[PDB]
């Protein structure tokens, strides 16, 4: 057998056999720099406090 | 032909700065 096989998306089809777009977001959580974070500001720096 | 790893290998499992310990 060729190992893939072709989904049958037809518009009658049942929901359970309709065709589902799925993206999976994975992120490593706090243990190195990081460059994507969310949109807080930022506010100066104080010492000795 | 082989050769004896005296005491290489060793790599900071972990991305966090430590000092003075022995963990």
């Given amino acids: 057998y060729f190992p893939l096989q072709s989904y049958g998306f037809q518009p009658t089809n049942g929901v359970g056999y309709q065709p589902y777009r799925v993206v999976v977001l994975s992120f490593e959580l706090l243990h190195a720099p990081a460059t994507v974070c969310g949109p807080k500001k930022s506010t100066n720096l104080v010492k000795n406090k | ?23």
């Fill in chain 2, 1 to 23: 032909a082989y050769t004896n790893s005296f005491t290489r290998g060793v790599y900071y499992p972990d991305k966090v700065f430590r000092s003075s310990v022995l963990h």
